[PDB]
Amino acid sequence: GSSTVDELTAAFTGGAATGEGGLTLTAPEIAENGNTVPIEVKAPGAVAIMLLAAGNPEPAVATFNFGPAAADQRAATRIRLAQTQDVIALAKMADGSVVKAQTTVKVTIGGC
């Protein structure tokens, strides 16, 4: 059996690999309050961006699906992180290809 992160990732990619480049994941180096951590993702051309928190008990955070009236493929939100961990963004392009970015966020107060 695979990890939950791996299972969610595989469902998103359809079993293809993730590439690199084509997206930005912006998160603080240190999140004072893990109850509310600002995150921004950008992936020009993406049909969807999925956010995972690899150290959370339920790692799926959100999936942003961009519609025809989106001007660009940027989204920002605020998330909960239980402890220091890697945050992962996966962006899917019109051709079905997926790119990945990952960064570590240090957490002081746990948010789960």
């Binding site: 921004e40 961009f66 001007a71 940027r74 989204a75 939100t77």
Partner: protein, 108 residues
């Protein structure tokens, strides 16, 4: 859920074809399913599980929301305003409630 007051910030007009930034907030506890009560028992999840923004009936963004989105969910994103009309914002609660906000937008 009670007192799920939406607040949206978006310009009220744009030049045709211009991008506008949209910021959408709603008040909601987003009980995650991971919090324990005084006796160590998990408190059941009850979150907003989906948010949509449509401009003139066409989707701008459709967000599937999980328990790791924060209390008082906040989403910011960019809409292309090709023509006048309105944004419709919808949030779907696990408890069955549906919250809505509508904002007009004019062109030039």
């Amino acid at each position: 859920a009670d007192d799920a007051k939406p607040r949206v910030k978006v310009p009220s007009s744009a030049k045709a074809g211009e991008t506008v930034t949209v910021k959408a907030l709603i008040s909601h506890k987003m009980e995650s399913g991971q919090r324990k009560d005084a006796d160590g028992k998990l408190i059941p999840r009850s979150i907003i599980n989906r948010f949509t923004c449509e401009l003139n009936g066409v989707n701008v963004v459709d967000v599937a929301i999980d328990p790791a989105v924060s209390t008082n969910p906040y989403f910011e994103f960019d809409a292309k305003v090709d023509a006048a009309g309105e944004f419709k914002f919808t949030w779907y609660d696990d408890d069955g409630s549906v919250y809505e906000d509508v904002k007009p937008i004019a062109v030039a």
